[PDB]
Structure 1
Amino acid sequence: HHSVFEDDLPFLEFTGSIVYSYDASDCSFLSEDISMSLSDGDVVGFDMEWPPLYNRGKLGKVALIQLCVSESKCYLFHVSSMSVFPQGLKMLLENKAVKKAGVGIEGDQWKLLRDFDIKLKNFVELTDVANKKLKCTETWSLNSLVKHLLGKQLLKDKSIRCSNWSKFPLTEDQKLYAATDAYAGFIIYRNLEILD
C-alpha cells in the first residue's frame, strides 16, 4: 500500500514548438533570434545531454544543449552533429544578460567548460530559488520540484534518458524528453519568481 503523496502523477510533456538544430550557422542565427526575443534579466530553462559511454575517465562529451525561452518554445542544439561549436550559442551561454535556470546547473557549468571551453554565465540553481521562495530548507531534484509545483512527474524511461544522445538524428522521443526537461526548468523558475 502507499499514500496519496506516493501516487503516480501524470507525466510532464512539452507541447509547444521544439526547434531542432544540427548545423552550426543555423544555431548561431537561432541564438540571435533568442536574443531578439528576450530583454536583460530574462531567464531561460537550461539543460544538456551526453552519450552513455565514458571517454578517458569522464562522462561522454556533451552532445545536446537545450534552451526553453518561453512557455511555447524550446531549442535543441545538437552540437555533437556540428563541425564547430556555434559562436552565437557560445556568446549566448556566456552572456550575463540572460539567466539560465536548472538543477545541478553548477555541475553543468563544469562539464561545459571541460568539453567546449565555454564559460556558462549567470546561472541559477533552482534548488536555491525554491528554498528561498517557498521558504523552506529542502534538497530538491528537478522531478520533486515538478511534482510539488505542477502536480506532475518527469518522463522516466531510463533507456531514453541514457540513450546515445550523440546519435544523429535524435528520435522524436529524445527530442520530447530533452525539450521537456528544459521546459520544466523554465516553468519552475517562472512560477517561483512570481511568489512574494
Structure 2
Amino acid sequence: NLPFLEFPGSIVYSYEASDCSFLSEDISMRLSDGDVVGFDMEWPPPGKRSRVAVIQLCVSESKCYLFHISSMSVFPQGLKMLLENKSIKKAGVGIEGDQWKLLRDFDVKLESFVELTDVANEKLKCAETWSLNGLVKHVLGKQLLKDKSIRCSNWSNFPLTEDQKLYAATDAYAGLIIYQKLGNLG
C-alpha cells in the first residue's frame, strides 16, 4: 500500500480570461530564467474532437493554478505569454503531446517544456515506458488516484468539482515534485 500523493496547498481556480491573464503575468513577474513550474492539461474524452479544457500550473507546493480555458471565450493573452516564455520551464509527463495539442487548438506555442520521463531514463539510467502515476511510484514512492471517474470526467463542465480540482492540481504538482527530485539527485 503506497501513500497517495495530493497537492497540499491552495488551488487558485480561474475561469475568466482577464483574471487568468492577470494571474499569469503575476507568475511571470515572480519567476526568472531557470525557474520551473509543474505543468499539465485536461480535456473531455462522433466527428468532433475535444479541445484543451484545463491548463494547470503548479508554481510551488503551496500554490497551484487551474485555468479553465473551456469556460473562456478568448484564450488568455497573459497565459499565452507565460507559456511561450522560454525563460520559464514547464515540467510534465507526455508534455510534448500537450505542446502539440496546444498548438493545434489555440496556436499557442509551449516553450521550454521538460519531459520528465526522459530526465528519468537518463538519470536513473533505465529504458522504461512510463505513465505519470508509474513515475510517481518509482521516484516519489507514492501513488496517484487515477480512476476513469475523475481522470476521464467531462473537464469542459463548469464549474470543476472539488475532486476534479484536486486531481488536476495534483497532476501538475506531481510534475513539479518529480522535477525537483530528479534535478537534485546525489
Normalising TM by the smaller chain, what interval? over 0.9
Q: Structure 2 CA distance, aligned partners of 1:139 and 1:51?
A: 24
Amino acid at match of 1:126: L
Aligned residue number for residue 109 of structure 1: 99
Aligned residue number for residue 4 of structure 1: none
Aligned residue number for residue 181 of structure 2: 191
Alpha-carbon distance, 1:137 to partner: 2.4
| TM-score normalised per structure 1 | 0.91
Q: Structure 1 CA distance, aligned partners of 2:96 and 2:42?
A: 15
Q: Structure 1 CA distance, aligned partners of 2:32 and 2:60?
A: 13
Aligned residue number for residue 98 of structure 1: 88
Q: Does 1:15 align with 2:8?
A: yes
| Contact 2:13–2:68 (CA under 8 A) maintained in structure 1 | yes
Q: Structure 1 CA distance, aligned partners of 2:52 and 2:65?
A: 16
Aligned residue number for residue 130 of structure 2: 140
Q: Mean alpha-carbon deviation: is it higher for 138-147 or for 90-99? A: 138-147
| Contact 2:8–2:61 (CA under 8 A) maintained in structure 1 | no
Amino acid at match of 1:112: L
Q: Which structure 2 segments of 5+ residues have no match?
A: none
| Contact 1:130–1:192 (CA under 8 A) maintained in structure 2 | yes
Q: Structure 2 CA distance, aligned partners of 1:75 and 1:139?
A: 29
Q: Which structure 1 segments of 5+ residues have no match?
A: 1-7
Q: Structure 1 CA distance, aligned partners of 2:9 and 2:47?
A: 35
Matches within 5 A, 1:55-94: 56=48, 58=49, 60-94=50-84
Secondary structure of 1:156's match?
Answer: coil
Amino acid at match of 1:14: F
Alpha-carbon distance, 1:55 to partner: 5.0
Q: Structure 2 CA distance, aligned partners of 1:183 and 1:87?
A: 24
Q: Which has the larger radius of gyration?
A: 1
Cα RMSD of the aligned pairs, angstroms, is 1.2
Q: Does 1:43 align with 2:36?
A: yes
Aligned residue number for residue 158 of structure 1: 148
Q: How many residues align?
A: 186
Q: Structure 1 CA distance, aligned partners of 2:81 and 2:38?
A: 17
Calculate percent identity across the aligned residue pairs: 85
